[PDB]
Design a protein around this ligand. Structure first.
Ligand SMILES: CCCCCCCCCCCCCCCCCC(=O)OC[C@H](COP(=O)([O-])OCC[N+](C)(C)C)OC(=O)CCCCCCCCCCCCCCCCC
Ligand SMILES: CCCCCCCCCCCCCCCCCC(=O)OC[C@H](COP(=O)(O)OCCN)OC(=O)CCCCCCCCCCCCCCCCC
Ligand code: SF4
Ligand code: SF4
Ligand code: SF4
Lengths: 79, 207, 156, 114, 115, 178
């Protein structure tokens, strides 16, 4: 739906994770290579999203949600 | 006739051997190494894929009404690659006879539960899991039964020390009961008691 | 009319009360609880001495550790003791409670209740004859006879 | 090289299960620091969860992973329900175990242990 | 005035006992002692949650029966009246209607507890 | 064979007398009055309570309580450090260290018993081939300290030198039954 405010909330949650360094943070940064993350610190981010927007989402998807833009599109498609 | 030795009757031996032939030729797909002992006891060894069929047949079949699960055990033999010898001792009230069914498992080779057959096995299988580490399938609530709520290890495994790895005490600093590594004031004394002279030549293991 | 003499007599009275009225707690773990019962039985009438089993720790004055203390049970024992109000005494009954006993080298036994709570009196046996547990109760009575708390307060 | 699988026919499905379990623990920690009146924060609990998870990161057999997940779900049940008290939860933190050093030389100064 | 006196004396006796019970003894307070009691282990929840009631209908009925008792209590005076037939008839009607209501409840299984 | 405990009930026959009897039972509380009568009878009986610690509970020579090491009438110790007592002690409570006494005899230096591990089973006194270790009759040996309950050679020897007059007689009584 609203790909602009969605993205604001998403980048906010990202900054709030407090495990990443904002230097390489963007709307298409790669959690693993760019920001230096792994599987579980991505699970945590996607669950922070679940909280923010309240809509519970599977793992079959939270696994492919590998960059903020994919989060934005998944939030937009479901909501 | 002799007063110290134990009176021995072959009639029960014959009965149990005939019934063992019965079971073996009625469940060939699962049965292995039926055998009967000097003391009159029937032991039917099987492949674990046959647990539920065998036990259901022995409970429901007419000439075999073993519908009371007395016990359900395990036996660690670290030598063989499949250590745990799971045992099902059963009882027929209609024939006043008992029988024992055995399978084999491993640390990473679980078997099926029989709570669908004998509800008495819920807690016994929980006990097997807690004590040896054998996992059962389709168990309603498989958790610990006897060990502490945060206990690591399966104590009845021969590889587990009699005294464990931790030890509990109360610490005023934290005001709680805490777990610290074991440290004993007197160490358990291991007595080598096996006589070096063959005692029963009927069980001699040829080299 | 010395205040020290008056305080000694007052302490005698305090201890007489806290002693002739010892309400233990219904806390029995293993076999030794049977001898506890038998010490509650006609032959050895506890109430005859003022002893009364109250089931709430908030009303009890002493707890007899009557049997084996496993690691899964020690937290509850320490909690109950903590919940008993001072003055609170403890009695270890049997060999399981004192030093683990026949299960000393087990992975699921605390080798002594004196690790989890502080113990005033140790009653040996497996099980201790109810007569022996009574001997221990009276030993505790005397230990209380020798508390001398108010004398200490006056000497401070 | 051929064996029977417990649940997962490969390591990826076992990883799916492991992730489900991580989510469950991450969501539960706050409720049990509230209920059990633990004197720790919510961040310490999740760091401890992650550490206990990494403690077995080296595994590659899906059967070991399945059994580890079963044990973790057992513990998560024991914790969601209050069958276990704050004692068993704080056992994880080892607040009293004097931390043995990994320096060869300190291990040399105190005792004969390697 | 004397009733006030006696009742206040009792208030004061009780309060004196409680004062000397809360200020005489030596205390040592800490959380593990002041915590609730649930048979050695920690509570799984608060005791301030809905504790379902299975005799709610019987309690409601008890209210009305208490009122019927309130209406029966003036008999010691109603028997000093000239119109005795009326008092007799009204008391009988009251008690009979009470019993009939109780019987209807009984039969329809109100006095039995929800399970 | 077998018997029924609550199937005695047969087909129902009822009279006016039976109905009235059951009615009186239900209205006058007959069966409860009988329990009242029993409790009353017990009030006028002699209580089984002994006056401890003045009059005490009975016992038998075989009673196995506190341990003691005995001696021969010459004063020499009976123990020879054969170690059956610690070899069988199923609680691993006994601890022994032997050494040739200066006169050359086989005797102990250490003989310790953790009376917090002893289960008071008696195996040690039936294993001792010299009737040295015994389980005496004393049971009134409670303490205020755990350490006091860790006996050594001197404590057991003193107990033996304290109870011999009783241990020996109880043995003399019981040793034919063994
Ligand atoms: C109808 C009901 C009838 C029953 C109620 C009748 C009860 C009347 C009892 C009269 C006895 C009065 C003395 C009781 C004092 C006991 C309190 C106590 O033990 O505390 C010790 C305390 C301990 O003092 P302390 O200074 O040594 O404490 C040091 C700190 N601790 C304890 C942590 C080590 O002694 C007193 O201070 C009390 C002094 C006695 C006079 C008090 C008035
Ligand atoms: C012309 C006449 C006109 C006048 C009209 C009156 C005529 C006379 C009528 C007499 C009626 C008898 C008296 C009524 C009282 C008894 C009421 C009663 O029977 O209750 C019985 C009740 C049920 O018993 P149950 O066996 O379970 O049967 C259940 C039904 N199927 O179970 C009970 O209620 C009893 C169980 C109670 C147990 C508690 C312990 C009792 C202790 C007993 C102590 C006895 C000492 C009494 C002392 C009294 C001194 C004040
Ligand atoms: S000391 Fe003996 S009698 Fe007492 S609880 Fe332990 S085993 Fe049972
Ligand atoms: S009585 Fe039994 S447990 Fe006690 S010291 Fe002798 S052998 Fe050991
Ligand atoms: S069995 Fe008797 S003689 Fe042998 S070591 Fe023990 S006490 Fe000494």
């Amino acid at each position: 739906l609203t790909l602009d405010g969605i993205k604001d909330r998403v980048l906010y949650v990202l900054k709030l994770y407090d495990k990443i360094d904002p230097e390489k943070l963007s709307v298409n940064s790669h959690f693993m290579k760019d920001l230096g993350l792994d599987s579980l610190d991505q699970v945590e981010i996607i669950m922070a999203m679940e909280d923010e927007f309240g809509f519970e989402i599977p793992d079959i998807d939270a696994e492919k949600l590998m960059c903020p833009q994919e989060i934005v599109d998944y939030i937009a498609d479901k909501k | 006739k002799r007063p110290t030795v134990r009176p021995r009757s072959d009639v029960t031996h014959k009965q149990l051997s005939a019934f063992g032939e019965y079971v073996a030729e009625i469940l060939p797909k699962y049965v292995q190494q039926v055998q009967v002992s000097c003391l009159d006891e029937l032991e039917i060894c099987i492949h674990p894929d046959g647990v539920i069929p065998t036990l259901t047949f022995l409970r429901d079949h007419t000439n075999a009404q073993f519908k009371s699960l007395a016990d359900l055990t395990a036996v660690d033999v670290p030598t063989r690659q499949n250590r745990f010898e799971i045992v099902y001792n059963l009882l027929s009230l209609r024939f006043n006879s008992r029988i024992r069914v055995k399978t084999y498992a491993d640390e990473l080779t679980p078997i099926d539960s029989i709570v669908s057959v004998h509800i008495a096995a819920n807690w016994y299988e929980r006990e097997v899991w807690d004590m040896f580490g054998v996992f059962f399938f389709n168990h309603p609530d498989l958790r610990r039964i006897l060990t502490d709520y945060g206990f690591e290890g399966h104590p009845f495994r021969k590889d587990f020390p009699l005294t464990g790895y931790v030890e509990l005490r109360y610490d005023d600093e934290v005001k709680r009961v805490v777990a610290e590594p074991v440290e004993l004031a007197q160490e358990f004394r291991k007595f080598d008691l096996n006589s070096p002279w063959e005692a029963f030549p009927a069980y001699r293991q040829p080299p | 009319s010395r205040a020290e003499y008056v305080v000694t007599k007052l302490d005698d009275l305090i201890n007489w009360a806290r002693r002739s009225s010892l309400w233990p707690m219904t806390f029995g773990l293993a076999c030794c609880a049977v001898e506890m019962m038998h010490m509650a039985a006609p032959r050895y009438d506890m109430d005859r001495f003022g002893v009364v089993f109250r089931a709430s720790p908030r009303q009890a004055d002493v707890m007899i550790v009557a049997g084996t203390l496993t690691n899964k049970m020690a937290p509850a024992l320490r909690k109950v003791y903590d919940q008993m109000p001072e003055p609170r005494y403890v009695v270890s009954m049997g060999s399981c409670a004192n030093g683990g006993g026949y299960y000393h080298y087990s992975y699921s036994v605390v080798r002594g209740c004196d690790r989890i709570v502080p113990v005033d009196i140790y009653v040996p046996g497996c099980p201790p004859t109810a007569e022996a547990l009574l001997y221990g109760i009276l030993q505790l009575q005397r230990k209380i006879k020798r508390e001398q708390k108010l004398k200490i307060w006056y000497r401070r | 090289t051929s064996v029977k699988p417990i649940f997962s026919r490969d390591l990826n499905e076992a990883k799916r299960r492991v992730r489900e379990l991580y989510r469950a623990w991450y969501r539960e920690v706050p409720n049990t620091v509230h209920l059990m009146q633990l004197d720790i924060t919510v961040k310490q609990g999740r760091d401890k969860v992650r550490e206990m998870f990494m403690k077995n990161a080296h595994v590659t057999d899906p059967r070991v992973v399945d059994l580890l997940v079963i044990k973790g779900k057992m513990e998560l049940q024991e914790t969601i329900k209050v069958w276990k008290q704050r004692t068993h939860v704080m056992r994880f933190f080892h607040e009293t175990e004097t931390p043995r050093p990994k320096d060869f030389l300190s291990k040399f100064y105190m005792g004969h242990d390697p | 005035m004397n009733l006030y006196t006696v009742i206040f004396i009792n208030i004061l006796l009780s309060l004196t006992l409680i004062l000397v019970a809360f200020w005489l003894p030596q205390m040592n307070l800490y959380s593990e002692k002041a915590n609730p009691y649930e048979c050695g282990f920690d509570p799984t929840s608060s005791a301030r949650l809905p504790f379902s009631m299975k005799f709610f209908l019987v309690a409601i009925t008890f209210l009305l029966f208490d009122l019927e008792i309130a209406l029966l209590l003036p008999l010691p005076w109603a028997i000093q009246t000239i119109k005795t037939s009326t008092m007799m008839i009204m008391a009988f009607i009251l008690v009979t209607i009470l019993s009939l209501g109780l019987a209807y409840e009984w039969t329809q299984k109100g006095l039995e507890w929800t399970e | 064979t077998y018997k029924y405990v609550n199937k005695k009930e047969q087909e129902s026959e009822v009279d006016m007398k039976s109905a009235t009897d059951n009615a009186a039972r239900i209205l006058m509380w007959t069966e409860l009055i009988r329990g009242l009568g029993m409790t009353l009878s017990y009030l006028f009986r002699e209580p089984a309570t002994i006056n401890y610690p003045f009059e005490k509970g009975p016992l038998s020579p075989r009673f196995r309580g506190e341990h003691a090491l005995r001696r021969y009438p010459s004063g020499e110790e009976r123990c020879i450090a054969c170690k059956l007592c610690e070899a069988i002690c199923p609680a691993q409570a006994i601890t022994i260290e032997a050494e040739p006494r200066a006169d050359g005899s086989r005797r102990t230096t250490r003989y310790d018993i953790d009376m917090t591990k002893c289960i008071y089973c008696g195996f040690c006194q039936e294993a001792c081939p010299v009737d040295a270790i015994v389980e005496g009759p004393n049971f009134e040996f409670s303490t205020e300290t755990h350490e006091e309950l860790l006996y050594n050679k001197e404590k057991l020897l003193n107990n033996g030198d304290k109870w011999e007059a009783e241990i020996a007689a109880n043995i003399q009584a019981d040793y034919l039954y063994r």
